Amino acid sequence: DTKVPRTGELALRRAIPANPSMKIIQASLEDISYLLRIPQRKPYGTMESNVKKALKVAIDDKDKILASIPVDLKDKGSELYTTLIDGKGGLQALITSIKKQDPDKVSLGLAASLDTVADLELLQASGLPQQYLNYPRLAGRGTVEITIEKADGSTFSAEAGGDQRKSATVQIVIDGYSAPLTAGNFAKLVTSGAYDGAKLNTVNQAVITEDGSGKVESVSVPLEVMPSGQFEPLYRTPLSVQDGELPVLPLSVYGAVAMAHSENSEEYSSPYQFFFYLYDKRNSGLGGLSFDEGQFSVFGYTIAGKDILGQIKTGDIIKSAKLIEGQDRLSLP
Numbered sequence: 001d002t003k004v005p006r007t008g009e010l011a012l013r014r015a016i017p018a019n020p021s022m023k024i025i026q027a028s029l030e031d032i033s034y035l036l037r038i039p040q041r042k043p044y045g046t047m048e049s050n051v052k053k054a055l056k057v058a059i060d061d062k063d064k065i066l067a068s069i070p071v072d073l074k075d076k077g078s079e080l081y082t083t084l085i086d087g088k089g090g091l092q093a094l095i096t097s098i099k100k101q102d103p104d105k106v107s108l109g110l111a112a113s114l115d116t117v118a119d120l121e122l123l124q125a126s127g128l129p130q131q132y133l134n135y136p137r138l139a140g141r142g143t144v145e146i147t148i149e150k151a152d153g154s155t156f157s158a159e160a161g162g163d164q165r166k167s168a169t170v171q172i173v174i175d176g177y178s179a180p181l182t183a184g185n186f187a188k189l190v191t192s193g194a195y196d197g198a199k200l201n202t203v204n205q206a207v208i209t210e211d212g213s214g215k216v217e218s219v220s221v222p223l224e225v226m227p228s229g230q231f232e233p234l235y236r237t238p239l240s241v242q243d244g245e246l247p248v249l250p251l252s253v254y255g256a257v258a259m260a261h262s263e264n265s266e267e268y269s270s271p272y273q274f275f276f277y278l279y280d281k282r283n284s285g286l287g288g289l290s291f292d293e294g295q296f297s298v299f300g301y302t303i304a305g306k307d308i309l310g311q312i313k314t315g316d317i318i319k320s321a322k323l324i325e326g327q328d329r330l331s332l333p
Contacts, residue, residue, distance in 0.1 A: 002228065002246045004281075004288050008173070008255050008301025012141075013114070015178050015248050017128045018121035019068040021061035025084075026117050028054040032110055036103065047106070048098045055091045058084055068124040077123045084116045125177055129235055132222070134333040136184035138176030142326030144190050144300070146170050148200065148312060149319040156308055167319060170305030172257050176329065178233065178248045182224045182259055182269060182299040187323050187330045189216065189272065195321040201314045205278045208260060209318070212272030221259070221269040224297045225249075236267040239294030242286070247298065252290040254279045255302030255309055269297045276302060276309050 005011035013026065028050045035043055035050075058065070062081065069077035084090050089112020097105040126140065147169045150156055156165040174183040189195060199210040226233035226248040239247050251258060256277040259269035281288045302309060323330070 002244055004246075004250060004252050006253075008253055008303055008306070011250060011253050011256075011301055012173055012175065012303075013118050013121075015175055016118065016121040017125045017177050019064060019124055021057055021065050022068075022117060022121050022124065024057050025054045026114070026121070028057075029110060029114050029117065032106075033114070036107055036110070042101065042103055044098055044101050048095060051091060051095050051098060055085075055095065058091060065120065065124075068127065069120075070123070070127045073123045073126065077120060080116055080120045080123070084113065084120065087112070087116070089113060089116065128177070132181055132235075135181050135219075135221075136188045136333060137180045137331050138174065138183040138187050138326065139180065139329040139331070140176050140326065142174045142176065142183065142187055142300075142329070143324050144172045144174060144187070144321060145324050146172065146195075146321050147319040148308075149317050151313070151315050154313060154316075156311055158308060168305060168308040168311075170308065171303050172300045173303050174257070174300035174326075175249055176326075178226045179224050179297060179299040180233075181221065181235075182297040184330060185219070185221050185269075185271070186259075186274065186299055187326065188332060190321045190323045191327060191330070192216075193321075194272065195318045198318045200312055200316045200318065202312065205280060205283065206275040207278065207309060207312045208275035209273050211260070211263070211270060213263075216272050219271045221262070221271055221297075223261075223267050223269060224299075225294055227294075238266070241289050241294045245294070246289070247294050249298040249300075250289070251277055251293050251296060251298050252279050252281075252284065252288065253277075253301060255306045256298050257300045257302060258296040258298040261296065266295070274299075276312075278310060 032047050032050050089109050094109040097109050149167045156168040157163040176183040194216050201208050222235040224233050225239045227239050228246050228248045260273040262268035285291050
């Protein structure tokens, strides 16, 4: 129950707070996703056993699944549940495609079922310290779009579209469920335009902004790290991962986004400076965990545009940063 999410997408779906029935269904389906990627004769027997396990939990725990959904969302939840069982992209259809041994219909139904699982979990999640009572806070998820502009000489090269782009744009999903203070502060800065024009730098395995000394408040933002299997984040306290533990939002994911530490203390984040983490499992310690795992306030993951992070160079700028989803769930103060 403590593996390193291969992608920001998997990190984010595992981080959705949901009830144990959904987490068991989710993990069963995510196992199959992995199995489908193995260069071997497809293990359709193992796949079928896993989906049968997911279906049994989904049928047996129907009442618990819907009970965890708030009253006003139970109709939406009931419709998602029906799809999860009997929809064309649902669990019964998945067992059928596995029996047929058509790997591309299995892959499609698996993606559909995992999407429905995530939406059900988000419905449940929407139902879930005094010193920070008036701090900016993000409830739930946000999406921040960051456009990076290259120096007049240099160029981005995507697989799509253009081997000589002056600018490229990435999307970061930030997770207020697991990092409400850090994501909240980030969202406030983005919405105020504070990152528009900020310089970027490459230092070791990180793309880090200039420090915004002045030009914003110098608020005290405590370190914020939620150990997985616990139900509140720790504040001002790094998480030791030497004996099997892992944060709900691990740093050890390519394109993870975290705040730098404050200028005076490892117990606090910078009010402004953040970085993309260019995780490389070659440079890692025990269990492939970054040597910095559990030590920084991770608050989101780069999803769209992941592949241009490694092309950013010192002197590139954040042309603009904008909170394109979730601003209704940002509380100020």
